[PDB]
Amino acid sequence: GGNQVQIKVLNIGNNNMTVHFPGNSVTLAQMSQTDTFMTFDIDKLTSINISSSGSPGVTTVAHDFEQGHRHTLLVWNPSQYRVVKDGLNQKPEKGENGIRFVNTLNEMVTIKMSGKVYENVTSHNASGYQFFPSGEKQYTINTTAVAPTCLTDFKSSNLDFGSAYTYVIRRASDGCLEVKEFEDIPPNT
Amino acid sequence: GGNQVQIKVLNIGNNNMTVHFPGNSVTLAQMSQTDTFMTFDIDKLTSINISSSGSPGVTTVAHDFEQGHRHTLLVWNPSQYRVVKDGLNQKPEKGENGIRFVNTLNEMVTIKMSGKVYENVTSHNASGYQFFPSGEKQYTINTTAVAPTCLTDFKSSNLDFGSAYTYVIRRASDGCLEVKEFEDIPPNT
């Protein structure tokens, strides 16, 4: 996955804190972290609650987790948090192509390509890159910005070896969707 | 560098735009980008102005750029922009150590290590990782959070091969700075 979210918790406060994930709670001492990234299916990550020892305050986490990515959930007293982006769940294989999408529409866009998802790419913003084996890839774009009758199926060009591309999503002259491809110098990250 | 900033410009609007960098101007047609990442010394990146054809509006990029990182400057009509982080300027060599810093102080912190900089890491926040060859590394931490008389020089432990670490910065019992090292699962990107 693809569809899996990896989360590590790092307690940077001065007391014991608990993060309640669906089906599993982790209590950490101050100045300590979970030894591993815990893995979840995005659809099963319904809510995340954070609490502190003694303090009755329970805080719910703003669902800012991207599938296919690792995150560090920073926690501190009194029930404070910050989600830090830690990059991809998997190291891209030699020869894979990095693809990111840029949304120029006034509504969010979701892109699904070869089992990978770029969810709710905001207006005039870029997603991070995700990596794919070479060759033409089919993908879909779903948004409220265009008529439901508009074409949602697209195809990437013949992806070279180890390249990186930015796919810019815009309105076509007929009012539907169009994608312009740009080659970028490969990311080092 | 290290102390270098890489910037590519991508015009995602519907008209011609100009980006004035110190000593060099780039004019882009709609749906076009600069063919390369232009490189600048952070200290020499005094200001960046963005303008559109016909529209008298000139916008200054007050938004920061991180040294040692690549960026995509997204531009669109009338004089809009967004700085997108594209990762590191250099691909980490096999065996290098990814190191990031977490600031738990109430003031921003700046860390300088082996020619690399982590500038203004905000309160209860993490920097991205930067990579270094193996062995003990000397580093400095400068902040307004502690007395100027406090020790600002630190040393990393004898760091292993391909190992990643998070250095958590906190106030020591004597009122000065203290750093706790955590080993991490190495980042993939």
How many domains does chain B contain in total? 2
Asked if B157 and B136 count as a contact pair (C-beta separation under 8 A), the reply is yes
DSSP string spanning A78-90? TTEEEEEEEEESS
Laid out side by side, the sheet with A153-155 consists of A116-121, A109-113, A138-142, A153-155
Asked if A124 and A103 count as a contact pair (C-beta separation under 8 A), the reply is yes
Chain B residue with Cα closest to A76: B124
Query: Does residue A170 sit in the same domain as residue A144?
Result: yes
Q: Which of A59, A90, A121 delimits the end of a domain?
A: A90
Residues of B in contact with A126 (CB under 8 A): 72, 74, 82, 84
Query: Does residue B123 sit in the same domain as residue B45?
Result: no
Query: Does residue B44 sit in the same domain as residue B124?
Result: no
Q: Which of B72, B90, B108 delimits the end of a domain?
A: B90
> Can you give the three-state secondary structure of chain B, one letter per residue?
CCCEEEEEEEECCCCCEEEEECCEEEEECCCEECCCCEEEEHHHCCCCEEEECCCCCEEECCCCCCCCEEEEEEEECCCEEEEEEEEECCCCCCCCEEEEEEECCCCCEEEEECCEEEEEECCCEECCCEEECCCCCEEEEECCCCCCCCCCEEECCCCCCCCEEEEEEEECCCCCEEEEEEEECCCCC
Token pair belonging to B145: 């959070």
- Interchain CB distance below 8 Å, A184 and B12: no
Specify the residue for token string 């091969």: B161
Strand pairing category for B125-126 and B97-103: antiparallel
Query: Does residue A59 sit in the same domain as residue A99?
Result: no
Of B10, B37, B82, Cβ closest to residue A125:
B82
Secondary structure letter of residue A47 according to DSSP: -
Query: Does residue A38 sit in the same domain as residue A86?
Result: yes
- Interchain CB distance below 8 Å, B74 and A189: no
Q: How many residues can be counted in chain B?
A: 189
Residues of A in contact with B12 (CB under 8 A): 102, 104, 124, 168, 170
Domain that holds residue A76: 1-90
Token pair belonging to B100: 């990031």
Of B82, B88, B188, Cβ closest to residue A91:
B188
Q: How close, in Å, is residue A97 to chain B by CA atoms? A: 14
Q: Which of B90, B122, B139 delimits the end of a domain?
A: B90
Query: Positive or negative CA dihedral for B157, B158, B160, B162?
Result: positive
Which is nearest to B186 in space by CA: B165, B159, B157? Answer: B165
- Interchain CB distance below 8 Å, B185 and A33: no
Of B74, B87, B189, Cβ closest to residue A124:
B74
Of A31, A84, A88, Cβ closest to residue B180:
A31
